[PDB]
Design a binder for these strands. Structure first.
Lengths: 610, 158
DNA sequence: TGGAGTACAAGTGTGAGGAAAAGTAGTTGGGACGAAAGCAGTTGAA
C-alpha cells in the first residue's frame, strides 16, 4: 500500500516522476516510488511460421479471425489428461470457414488436418472465454459471432492417436430483432448495438435468452463498438462503448456508471487479464490497469500509464508472467494503420503494490499492418515472452518469441503480356540491341588500336577546322538578324565527334578553340566549373572527371574502358550549348520588354537593391 | 526525464520544472464552456481547483532530490508560501518534508535543551499537516503506518 | 464481302476544393489635531 492515490484514480504516467513516497527510513533505498529500478530490457524477435490459409474508414464490428489457447475437454476429467492446445481460424473466400501441439515452439501437429466446419455468414469475431482457477478446470466450449446468426461450438474429446479434433455445435440463433450483435464473453452473453441480454447454454446438442436484460443506449454516441466482460466472479458485468463504462450487477437491480470518457479521450480496447483481480483497460491517451477491490468487488483503479500515441484504431493484448516473488503484466498495444507495437512493464506484489518499469517499442513485417495479436499462455531476471501476430492484407500467421537476451504485384500486373506472336515481336528489340551494341564495342576498339597517332592528330586538326568556319558560318547570321527586338545546337556537323580518341586532347582542343574567339558575338560556358553536378563534389577539371569514373566502373563492365570513354565523350557533346553571343545580345533584349509594358511595371522591375 | 537521466552537464530536470511552474502559474478558473483545442487539462495546464502536474512533480522531485543530497528548510519555506487550499497532495508533501527533518535530527549524536524541542516541533507539524491532508478530498495515506514512525522518532528521543 | 452495334481514348464545359494570417467571438480578470468662560437679552412660571 503506497500513498499517492486519488481513491477515484491512480497514476504512474509517462516519465513524469510518479506521485508518491512513503519515506521508509530503512537504509534500503528509503523511498517506494511507483517507478521501480532495474537494468534495461531489449526484445528480439524469433520469426517463424505457424500456419496459413472506401478504404478511408474501417469497420469496428469486425473483431478478430483467430484464437489460440489451451483447452481441456470432457474426457480429460475422468482420465488423467490435463490440457490440449488449439488454434481455430476463419478461412475460405469471404471469411466463412472456421477450422496444434507444442514441441518446443508451437507448430501445427503431425496429422495436421483442418477441421473445416462450414458456415454461410462472414466471421467477425472468434474468441473463447478463457478459464477459471476457482472452477479448477478449463472450459471446452467456444462461441463465434457472424452477421446472420450467433454460434456456439463445443470441443469434445480431442484425439491423440489421430491428432483429429471432432467438433460439435449448438443451435445458431438467427435474429428476431434486426440489429448486429458485437461481443461475446462467458467467464450467449452478448452485446447488441445498444442493448444486452443473458443467454443460456444447454447440455444437449441432440435436438436462449433468460428473463433479465438491460440496455446502455446513448443517443449521442455514434460508433458501433461495444464490449462486455464479467467482472470478479460476482456475476457483475462490465459494458462498454467509446464513451462510458457502465457497471451492471444483474444479481440485484444495480447499475453504476464508473468511467465517463466523453471529454478528452475514448475507450479503445478492454482485455480481461486471467488474474481475477487485475484487469487492463486501454483508453485513448492513457493505459489503465484498474483491478478489483477486496472490500467491494467494484473497481480498484490502479496505477495507470499515460501512453503517448494518438490514434483511432488501437487494440491491446496482455500476457501475465508469473514469477515466485511477484507477477508481471506486460501490455502490448497495436494499431491497424501502421506496423508497430508499444509495450510497458508492470509488476504486482502481495499488498496491491502495482508498479511500473518503463516502455519500449519494436517493429513488424513490412507487408501490411497488424490486425490480430495473441499471446500463447506458455502452460501457466531474463524475461522471455512469446506470441503470434496477424497482419492485415495478408492471410499468413507467424509465431514470435521475445527474449531479454516490399514486392507489389501491381508492377507485375503492368508487364508480361500473354501474346505469343507479340512475344518475340517485342523480344526482337532485345535481340536487335545484341547487334547494335557489339558494333560499338568493336568500332571504338579500332580506336583502341591506335594511340595518339599523327593520323588522328590530322583527324582532330580536321575537327576544329569544321568547328572554326562552322562557327564563322553560325556567327555571320546573328549579326544581320540582330535587330530582332522580340541558344544554338552545335550538332550541325554529322561527320565527326564520333571517332575521336583522346579526352585530354579535345579538352585542350576546345580550350584551343576557346582562345581563338577574342571577338564579339561569341562567348561560352566553361565545363570544368559545371561538370561536378554528377559526382556531387568539387570537380575542377574534365581530365580528373574521367579519373573519377576510371576507378568507378572497373568491375561491372567487360573490359570496362571504352564504354566509360564514350560517355565522357558524350557529355561534353551532350551540353552542346556553346553558342552564346556576347553580353550585348540579352542586355538589348532586357531594355525592349520594359518599354513594352506600361509605366506601372517600371517600378515593379528593379533587381540589385541591397 | 532527459535532463535528469543525462547526468553530464545536467540541470537534473529540477531547474526546468522550476521554469515550468514559474511561467505557467495560473490561478484562473476553468471556464468549462468553450471547446478546447491543443490544450488539455490533466497534464499540461494548472487552473484553480487543479494543481498542475509539473507543479506536484516539482514538489516530489525536489523532496527526493534533497534527501539524496545528504536545504530542506528552503523547500519547506517554499511549500509554506503556496497554501494550495484545494487539494491534499501538497499537504502530504508538506507533512512529509517535516517528517524528513524529524527523521534526520532523531539520531542525537551522543552515544541539548534545543535539540529536544525542535524535533517536537517537526513531529507536531507532521501530525497537524497530515490531519488537514486527511480532512480534504481523496488522497488516502497509510495514516496508521506513519504514526508508527512518528512514535519511533520520539522513542529514540525519549 | 457491305452493315449493325459499341468500348477506348482524343477531346470539351461545369464549380469545388485548398490554404493562411489577419480580424472578431465569449468568459474571466481587474479600475477607483477641537467634549473652551462667565454673561446677556429674552424668557421660564410665580
Amino acid at each position: 500500500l503506497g500513498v499517492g492515490v486519488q481513491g477515484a484514480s491512480l497514476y504512474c504516467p509517462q516519465e513524469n516522476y510518479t506521485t508518491k513516497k512513503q519515506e521508509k527510513p530503512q537504509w534500503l533505498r528509503p523511498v517506494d516510488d511507483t517507478l521501480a529500478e532495474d537494468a534495461l530490457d531489449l526484445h528480439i524477435v524469433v520469426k517463424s511460421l505457424l500456419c496459413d490459409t472506401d478504404a478511408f474508414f474501417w469497420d469496428p464490428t469486425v473483431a478478430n479471425r483467430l484464437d489460440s489457447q489451451y483447452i481441456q475437454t470432457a474426457s480429460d476429467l475422468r482420465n488423467y489428461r490435463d490440457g490440449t492446445e488449439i488454434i481455430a481460424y476463419a478461412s475460405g473466400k469471404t471469411g466463412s470457414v472456421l477450422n496444434l501441439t507444442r514441441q518446443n515452439t508451437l507448430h501445427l501437429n503431425r496429422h495436421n488436418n483442418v477441421t473445416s466446419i462450414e458456415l454461410h455468414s462472414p466471421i467477425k469475431s472468434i474468441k473463447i472465454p478463457g478459464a477459471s482457477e476457482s472452477i479448477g478446470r478449463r472450459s471446452n466450449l467456444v462461441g463465434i459471432i457472424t452477421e446472420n446468426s450467433f454460434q456456439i461450438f463445443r470441443i469434445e474429446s480431442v484425439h491423440s492417436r489421430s491428432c483429429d479434433v471432432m467438433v460439435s455445435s449448438s443451435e445458431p440463433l438467427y435474429f428476431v430483432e434486426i440489429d448486429d450483435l458485437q461481443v461475446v464473453d462467458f467467464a450467449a452473453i452478448i452485446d447488441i448495438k445498444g442493448n444486452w441480454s443473458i443467454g443460456r447454454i444447454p447440455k444437449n446438442f441432440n435436438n436462449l435468452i433468460d428473463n433479465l436484460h438491460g440496455t446502455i443506449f446513448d443517443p449521442e454516441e455514434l460508433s458501433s463498438w461495444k464490449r462486455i466482460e464479467w467482472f470478479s466472479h460476482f456475476q457483475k458485468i462490465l459494458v462498454f462503448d467509446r464513451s462510458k463504462m457502465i457497471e451492471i450487477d444483474f444479481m440485484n437491480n444495480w447499475q453504476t456508471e464508473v468511467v465517463q470518457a466523453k471529454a478528452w479521450s475514448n475507450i479503445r480496447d478492454y482485455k480481461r487479464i486471467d488474474d481475477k483481480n487485475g484487469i487492463l483497460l486501454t483508453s485513448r491517451e492513457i493505459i489503465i490497469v484498474g483491478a478489483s477491490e477486496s472490500n467491494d468487488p467494484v473497481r480498484r483503479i490502479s496505477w495507470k500509464h499515460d501512453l503517448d500515441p494518438d490514434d483511432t484504431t488501437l487494440r491491446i493484448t496482455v500476457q501475465k508472467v508469473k514469477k515466485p516473488d511477484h507477477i508481471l503484466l506486460v501490455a502490448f498495444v497495436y494499431s491497424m494503420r501502421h506496423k508497430r507495437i508499444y509495450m510497458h512493464v508492470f509488476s504486482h506484489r502481495k499488498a496491491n503494490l502495482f508498479q511500473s518499469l518503463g516502455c519500449s517499442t519494436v517493429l513488424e513485417i513490412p507487408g501490411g499492418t497488424p490486425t490480430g495479436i495473441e499471446t500463447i499462455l506458455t502452460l501457466d531476471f531474463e524475461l522471455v515472452v512469446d506470441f503470434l501476430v496477424k497482419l492485415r492484407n495478408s492471410s499468413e500467421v507467424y509465431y514470435y518469441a521475445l527474449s531479454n537476451t516490399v514486392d507489389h504485384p501491381e508492377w507485375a500486373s503492368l508487364f508480361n503480356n500473354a501474346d505469343e506472336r507479340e512475344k518475340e515481336s517485342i523480344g526482337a528489340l532485345v535481340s536487335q540491341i545484341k547487334l547494335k551494341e557489339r558494333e560499338r564495342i568493336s568500332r571504338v576498339q579500332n580506336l583502341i588500336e591506335h594511340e595518339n597517332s599523327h593520323d588522328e592528330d590530322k583527324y582532330l586538326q580536321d575537327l576544329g577546322y569544321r568547328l572554326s568556319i562552322a562557327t564563322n558560318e553560325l556567327l555571320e547570321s546573328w549579326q544581320k538578324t540582330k535587330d530582332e527586338s522580340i541558344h544554338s545546337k552545335l550538332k550541325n556537323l554529322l561527320e565527326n565527334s564520333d571517332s575521336f580518341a583522346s579526352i585530354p586532347e579535345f579538352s585542350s582542343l576546345l580550350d584551343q578553340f576557346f582562345q581563338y574567339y577574342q571577338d564579339q558575338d561569341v562567348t561560352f560556358i566553361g565545363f570544368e566549373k559545371l561538370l561536378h553536378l554528377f559526382l556531387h563534389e568539387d570537380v575542377p577539371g574534365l581530365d580528373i572527371f574521367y579519373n573519377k569514373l576510371l576507378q568507378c566502373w572497373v568491375l561491372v563492365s567487360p573490359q570496362a574502358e571504352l564504354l566509360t570513354k564514350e560517355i565522357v565523350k558524350d557529355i561534353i557533346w551532350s551540353l552542346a550549348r556553346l553558342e552564346k553571343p556576347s553580353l550585348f545580345e540579352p542586355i538589348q533584349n532586357e531594355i525592349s520588354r520594359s518599354l513594352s509594358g506600361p509605366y506601372q511595371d517600371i517600378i515593379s522591375s528593379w533587381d540589385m537593391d541591397d | 526525464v532527459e535532463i535528469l537521466d543525462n547526468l553530464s552537464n545536467s540541470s537534473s530536470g529540477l531547474d526546468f520544472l522550476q521554469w515550468m511552474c514559474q511561467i505557467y502559474s495560473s490561478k484562473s478558473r476553468f471556464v468549462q464552456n468553450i471547446n478546447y483545442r491543443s490544450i488539455v487539462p490533466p497534464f499540461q495546464t494548472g487552473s484553480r481547483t487543479h494543481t498542475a502536474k509539473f507543479a506536484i512533480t516539482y514538489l516530489w522531485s525536489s523532496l527526493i532530490n534533497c534527501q539524496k543530497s545528504m536545504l530542506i528548510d528552503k523547500i519547506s519555506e517554499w511549500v509554506l508560501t503556496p497554501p494550495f487550499m484545494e487539494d491534499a497532495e501538497v499537504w502530504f508533501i508538506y507533512a512529509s518534508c517535516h517528517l524528513l527533518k524529524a527523521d534526520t535530527l532523531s539520531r542525537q549524536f551522543v552515544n541539548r535543551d534545543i535539540k529536544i524541542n525542535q524535533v517536537i516541533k517537526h513531529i507536531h507539524y507532521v501530525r497537524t499537516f497530515l490531519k488537514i491532508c486527511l480532512d480534504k478530498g481523496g488522497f488516502a495515506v497509510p495514516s496508521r503506518l506513519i504514526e508508527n514512525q512518528l512514535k519511533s522518532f520520539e522513542s529514540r528521543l525519549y
